[PDB]
Amino acid sequence: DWVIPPINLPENSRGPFPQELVRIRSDRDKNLSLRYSVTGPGADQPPTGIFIINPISGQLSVTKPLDRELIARFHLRAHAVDINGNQVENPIDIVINVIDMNDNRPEFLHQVWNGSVPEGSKPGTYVMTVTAIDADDPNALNGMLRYRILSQAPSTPSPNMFTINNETGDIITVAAGLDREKVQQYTLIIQATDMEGNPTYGLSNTATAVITVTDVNDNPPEFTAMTFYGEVPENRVDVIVANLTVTDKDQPHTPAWNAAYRISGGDPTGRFAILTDPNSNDGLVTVVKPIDFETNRMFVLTVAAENQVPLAKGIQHPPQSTATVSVTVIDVNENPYFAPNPKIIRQEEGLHAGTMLTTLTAQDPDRYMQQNIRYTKLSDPANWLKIDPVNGQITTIAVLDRESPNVKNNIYNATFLASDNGIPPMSGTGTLQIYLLDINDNAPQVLPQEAETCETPEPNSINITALDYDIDPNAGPFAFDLPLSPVTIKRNWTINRLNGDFAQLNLKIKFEAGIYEVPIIITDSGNPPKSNISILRVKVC
Amino acid sequence: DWVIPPINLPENSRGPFPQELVRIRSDRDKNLSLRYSVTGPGADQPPTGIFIINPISGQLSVTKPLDRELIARFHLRAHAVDINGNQVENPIDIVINVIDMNDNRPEFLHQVWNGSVPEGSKPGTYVMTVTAIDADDPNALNGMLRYRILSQAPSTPSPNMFTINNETGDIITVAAGLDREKVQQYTLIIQATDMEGNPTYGLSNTATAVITVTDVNDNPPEFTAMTFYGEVPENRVDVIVANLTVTDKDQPHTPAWNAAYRISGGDPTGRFAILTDPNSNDGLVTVVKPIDFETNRMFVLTVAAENQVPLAKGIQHPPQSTATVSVTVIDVNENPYFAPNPKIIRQEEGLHAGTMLTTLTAQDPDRYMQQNIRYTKLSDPANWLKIDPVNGQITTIAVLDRESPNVKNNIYNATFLASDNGIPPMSGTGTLQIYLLDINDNAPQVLPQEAETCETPEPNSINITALDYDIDPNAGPFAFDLPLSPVTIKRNWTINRLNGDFAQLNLKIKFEAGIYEVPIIITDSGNPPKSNISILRVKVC
Ligand SMILES: *[C@@H]1O[C@H](CO)[C@@H](O[C@@H]2O[C@H](CO)[C@@H](O)[C@H](O)[C@H]2NC(C)=O)[C@H](O)[C@H]1NC(C)=O
Ligand SMILES: *[C@@H]1O[C@H](CO)[C@@H](O[C@@H]2O[C@H](CO)[C@@H](O)[C@H](O)[C@H]2NC(C)=O)[C@H](O)[C@H]1NC(C)=O
Numbered sequence A, B: 001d002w003v004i005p006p007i008n009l010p011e012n013s014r015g016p017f018p019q020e021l022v023r024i025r026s027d028r029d030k031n032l033s034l035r036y037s038v039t040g041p042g043a044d045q046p047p048t049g050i051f052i053i054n055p056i057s058g059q060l061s062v063t064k065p066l067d068r069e070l071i072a073r074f075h076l077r078a079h080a081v082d083i084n085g086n087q088v089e090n091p092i093d094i095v096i097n098v099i100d101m102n103d104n105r106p107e108f109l110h111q112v113w114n115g116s117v118p119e120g121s122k123p124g125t126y127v128m129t130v131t132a133i134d135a136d137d138p139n140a141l142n143g144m145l146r147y148r149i150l151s152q153a154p155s156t157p158s159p160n161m162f163t164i165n166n167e168t169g170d171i172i173t174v175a176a177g178l179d180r181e182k183v184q185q186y187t188l189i190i191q192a193t194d195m196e197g198n199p200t201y202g203l204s205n206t207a208t209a210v211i212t213v214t215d216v217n218d219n220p221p222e223f224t225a226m227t228f229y230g231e232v233p234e235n236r237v238d239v240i241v242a243n244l245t246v247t248d249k250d251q252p253h254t255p256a257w258n259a260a261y262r263i264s265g266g267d268p269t270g271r272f273a274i275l276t277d278p279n280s281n282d283g284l285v286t287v288v289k290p291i292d293f294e295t296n297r298m299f300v301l302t303v304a305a306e307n308q309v310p311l312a313k314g315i316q317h318p319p320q321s322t323a324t325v326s327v328t329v330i331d332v333n334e335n336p337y338f339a340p341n342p343k344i345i346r347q348e349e350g351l352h353a354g355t356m357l358t359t360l361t362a363q364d365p366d367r368y369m370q371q372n373i374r375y376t377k378l379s380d381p382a383n384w385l386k387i388d389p390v391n392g393q394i395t396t397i398a399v400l401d402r403e404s405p406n407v408k409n410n411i412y413n414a415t416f417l418a419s420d421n422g423i424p425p426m427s428g429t430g431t432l433q434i435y436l437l438d439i440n441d442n443a444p445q446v447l448p449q450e451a452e453t454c455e456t457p458e459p460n461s462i463n464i465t466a467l468d469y470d471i472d473p474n475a476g477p478f479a480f481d482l483p484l485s486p487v488t489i490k491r492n493w494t495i496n497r498l499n500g501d502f503a504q505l506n507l508k509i510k511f512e513a514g515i516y517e518v519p520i521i522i523t524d525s526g527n528p529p530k531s532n533i534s535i536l537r538v539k540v541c
């Protein structure tokens, strides 16, 4: 089957309507009287009445102008019937192609397009892409789009910072001088022209591209002053010294604005540490390890600034990226102390009142503030000791008796104070412990002081020992003897050695009631040996 | 079978070519690979290559612009064959109608059109018709013509003598004053404009109509002079009298210029007749019947002019259509004549010499020229007659003898002349015949004059009769007698009567030779009777 040629109509016809197009008829009309009719969308189905057919002549016609963007192709079919109702021809397909006209301006999806580009990017850097669409036929000139830029705001540093690939709509940069710290955002008017951007024939329409310039690290941190000043006490470990104040021209609170300090020198021992204040962007220098004034009176330290992210290629590191802090140190008053802590001195027991035993040395760390050393009495339960403020020498007040309940253990303990005449007065407690050697200076006594027995000439009635306040050898074996005079006593009594320390006494008369006081000479070892005539009270019946 | 719609193309397309029109294809191409081709005049037959078909797509195209006036409709048919040579569709008819454009100016058959109109025809009179043709479609505006007049030469009496029925092209008159004797021919520029004579859109073209104004009888014949003069002799019958000279302002030698004269009066007797000179248009007056001067000395005749065809409606008959001719008549000398022609007069015979017999009357027609009448001798063989010039009276010269060989018959004939003393002298011959009565004036004689016989006394020897020169009764019976003396004769002889006219003589003596003269008296009747003695000579032996 040969196919009835399609009818090719341009849209937006001016008419006048009903505009006639074509005449379909059946050759069977040589003898039959036929009636024609079209069916289908555009004819009898919606949209109704666009295409009509003269029932007699078979002439086809359009009644209004067409619109390709509304309907592009109509599919009518044509009918043939004689006046007696017989179908004379099978319905036949007939096509109307509506041919495109350029009656649609290009349109942009958005009316505002957002894009961003980094600072000082090489000319040729892609930024963003803006595209329009055309409701007309893409396959025809009518729907083929070209792009260009109409205006840039603002016009600095160059009027034409950007361009646009007139087909793809890629906005690419063509100048240099994209500096956030000067012009932080550009607004562009993009224009779309169809008909392949033909100036006289093309229909045009615009949009906006807003390009924001994103920050980079191209400004170094710069200290507000060349030199800073701070103060620190001795022996402190968590105190702020100074606040280092900087300016960075980049974007606040970006890594490229955040400061990164380190102490380049002036503290070879690590007394200070540095941390960046998150909010204020300051160099907080803090004493991390304690300092000694008498080793260091002043600190002079250099400190270098930087950012968290590296600086840009061609930018200079200025002198103003380095400042110097002078740390003046405040000196404090401190405790005095002593060469030995518990000054040990050996000394014999019996000694004069007024003998200089030993001197007590005491010194002070404060080498730059010279002071009065105040030696004073503290705690000696015996009061045998004297000391003067200027000298610190120790002299005896009394005789030093080691067999005393004031010297419980073999040595005597004594405390002393050394005080500062400084505004905050300090003091240190010194000890003196002295070893007292036992000399034989105690006369032996008789132990059974009140030994009393009746008149029995018993072979061993009374046994006597010695009381001595001295330790070996100043006690040892004791000699027991009766005196020669009065003559009566050795005539009444007799003494016998047992071993060393124990001796017996017994009456050698044969025979009353009362008191008999019997003198006894007792001597102990330690030379020169001391004797004593301790009297024994005896009661006999 | 549904019929592929015809393709409707305007002629004179601007292209660009090859301009595509329609796409025919077979739906059988769903699986077959087809090849298309057109055939027919305009395709493969002459004219070749106007319409081509893309063998693959089936697209049809024109290659040059069309011309409706050259070919109006193309009848191509389209073919379909698969790549393996099979005919897939029966060839199908396809029609290109070339639609008309107005690209032809109207054309006139002739470039010069001839027509004629009579003088002073009523406004509305049809003259001629001029028509153009248009090579474009008559059924369309393009070939629909309108007419108008662009110019008239000359512009008098009115600029716009004619108009033209803008559709039929009939040139009809609209003014008055069509006067041949002023403007004899008009030239018209006719213009044809197509597009129904549309001034801005129509294409125009011209021709010429030359209108000649045909003559009518609207000018009367007018005599050059009020009066004319001529001269005529007496008794003439084919002589020209005068040439009547006229002017007619109409067209020479047309019936409306030809003169027609008649004599309205002045000649109640029909002496003159008038004929028109074919060439000179003159009134030739000719003497058709002879005239007599003595009855008419002068003629005064009025003569009316006219044309062969009647004069036009409103025109006046002038006085100058009537002239008057004075015919002066020249008088001629004419013959004189006589009251009686052969003047008969009775007269007795014997009459004196000098007797006035009768007078001869003679008269003359010339009543206005009085003349001398000249009576003269002519022919009389006897000379008995005399006549004098002044009187005309006749008197006798001699004695009038009727018995003469000069008057053979009973009467005497005599001729006479009467002559004119005029410059051309005329004359008339008069006759006079006179009856002469016989009187007895002749003496009788003897008839046998020489009767001679011998001497015999014979009873009847000599018989004698009479000789008389007169007729009865002046002869009649004659008496015969012998004289008394001499005495001897009646003694010798004797006379005897026989009857009347015859008598006998005889000698009565008894007895020689010689001559005997015998006298005899003889008398005749007519009174007074005359006798005579006639002698008879006788010889006897
Ligand atoms: C879009 O860009 C194209 C490619 O740069 C342009 O096409 C060129 O235009 C120049 C005119 O100066 C011609 O000399 C060249 O022949 C073109 N190059 C080719 C082969 O593509 C075009 O001008 C631009 N469109 C507009 C009007 O902006
Ligand atoms: C030819 O003649 C016709 C008939 O006279 C003209 O047609 C008329 O034109 C006048 C314009 O003055 C109109 O008002 C009338 O309506 C017309 N009459 C009709 C009904 O035919 C015509 O103008 C002439 N053509 C030209 C242009 O010369």
Ligand SMILES: *[C@H]1O[C@H](CO)[C@@H](O[C@@H]2O[C@H](CO)[C@@H](O)[C@H](O)[C@H]2NC(C)=O)[C@H](O)[C@H]1NC(C)=O
Pocket: A407, A408, A409, A410, A411, A412, A413, A433
């Ligand atoms: C001062 O002298 C010494 C200081 O060492 C004291 O003697 C010590 O006493 C303690 C009792 O708790 C014993 O256990 C130690 O053996 C002793 N020290 C040594 C190692 O000798 C003494 O008590 C102090 N004061 C007195 C009362 O003398």
Ligand SMILES: *[C@H]1O[C@H](CO)[C@@H](O[C@@H]2O[C@H](CO)[C@@H](O)[C@H](O)[C@H]2NC(C)=O)[C@H](O)[C@H]1NC(C)=O
Pocket: B407, B408, B409, B410, B411, B412, B413, B433
């Ligand atoms: C003159 O007289 C008469 C004129 O009539 C002549 O007589 C006639 O002569 C002819 C001869 O030819 C006769 O026949 C006639 O009878 C005569 N006339 C009549 C009627 O009488 C005559 O001849 C003339 N002349 C002479 C010689 O006399």
Ligand SMILES: *C1O[C@H](CO)[C@@H](O)[C@H](O)[C@H]1NC(C)=O
Pocket: A110, A112, A113, A114
């Ligand atoms: C850019 O962001 C702004 C909001 O400030 C908005 O108006 C716009 O739609 C954004 N651009 C697009 C289309 O992504």
Ligand SMILES: *C1O[C@H](CO)[C@@H](O)[C@H](O)[C@H]1NC(C)=O
Pocket: A240, A243, A280, A282
């Ligand atoms: C210095 O540091 C202290 C504690 O961080 C703060 O009180 C003070 O405001 C700082 N100086 C400035 C101006 O940042």
Ligand SMILES: *C1O[C@H](CO)[C@@H](O)[C@H](O)[C@H]1NC(C)=O
Pocket: B110, B112, B113, B114
């Ligand atoms: C009119 O006659 C002239 C000759 O004088 C001639 O040129 C012309 O053809 C005639 N007109 C027509 C077409 O009859």
Ligand SMILES: *C1O[C@H](CO)[C@@H](O)[C@H](O)[C@H]1NC(C)=O
Pocket: B240, B243, B280, B282
């Ligand atoms: C008068 O008529 C005579 C004869 O026809 C001729 O010779 C003469 O020329 C005429 N006159 C004129 C001027 O026609």
Ligand SMILES: *[C@H]1O[C@H](CO)[C@@H](O)[C@H](O)[C@H]1NC(C)=O
Pocket: A488, A489, A492, A516, A517, A518
């Ligand atoms: C010794 O004994 C005698 C007993 O007669 C006594 O008198 C004397 O006082 C005694 N002496 C002493 C004190 O032993």
Ligand SMILES: *[C@H]1O[C@H](CO)[C@@H](O)[C@H](O)[C@H]1NC(C)=O
Pocket: B488, B489, B492, B516, B517, B518
């Ligand atoms: C008569 O007769 C005689 C004869 O004798 C003669 O003498 C005479 O002369 C005659 N007369 C005549 C003349 O007759």
Ligand SMILES: *C1O[C@H](CO)[C@@H](O)[C@H](O)[C@@H]1O
Pocket: A111, A112, A206, A207, A208, A209
């Ligand atoms: C983009 O931006 C602004 C507002 O949307 C306009 O000035 C411009 O015409 C375009 O729409």
Ligand SMILES: *C1O[C@H](CO)[C@@H](O)[C@H](O)[C@@H]1O
Pocket: B111, B112, B206, B207, B208, B209
């Ligand atoms: C009719 O008459 C003459 C010569 O033919 C031209 O003047 C005029 O244009 C028209 O042809």
Ligand SMILES: *[C@@H]1O[C@H](CO)[C@@H](O)[C@H](O)[C@@H]1O
Pocket: A189, A205, A206, A207
């Ligand atoms: C394109 O932009 C231009 C300039 O702002 C306007 O004229 C138009 O309305 C469209 O937004």
Ligand SMILES: *[C@@H]1O[C@H](CO)[C@@H](O)[C@H](O)[C@@H]1O
Pocket: A226, A227, A302, A322, A323, A324, A325
């Ligand atoms: C720190 O700044 C001081 C200025 O007082 C310099 O003397 C030193 O060299 C360092 O740069």
Ligand SMILES: *[C@@H]1O[C@H](CO)[C@@H](O)[C@H](O)[C@@H]1O
Pocket: A427, A428, A429, A430
């Ligand atoms: C001496 O030392 C004592 C400790 O026994 C302290 O309490 C006193 O303050 C002084 O420094």
Ligand SMILES: *[C@@H]1O[C@H](CO)[C@@H](O)[C@H](O)[C@@H]1O
Pocket: B189, B205, B206, B207
């Ligand atoms: C029609 O007549 C006009 C005027 O004579 C001319 O212009 C033209 O040539 C044609 O003959």
Ligand SMILES: *[C@@H]1O[C@H](CO)[C@@H](O)[C@H](O)[C@@H]1O
Pocket: B226, B227, B302, B322, B323, B324, B325
């Ligand atoms: C002929 O012409 C004459 C003029 O001489 C008139 O007298 C006469 O009446 C007639 O018209």
Ligand SMILES: *[C@@H]1O[C@H](CO)[C@@H](O)[C@H](O)[C@@H]1O
Pocket: B427, B428, B429, B430
């Ligand atoms: C007399 O008549 C005669 C005729 O007999 C003429 O011949 C002559 O001229 C005259 O008129």
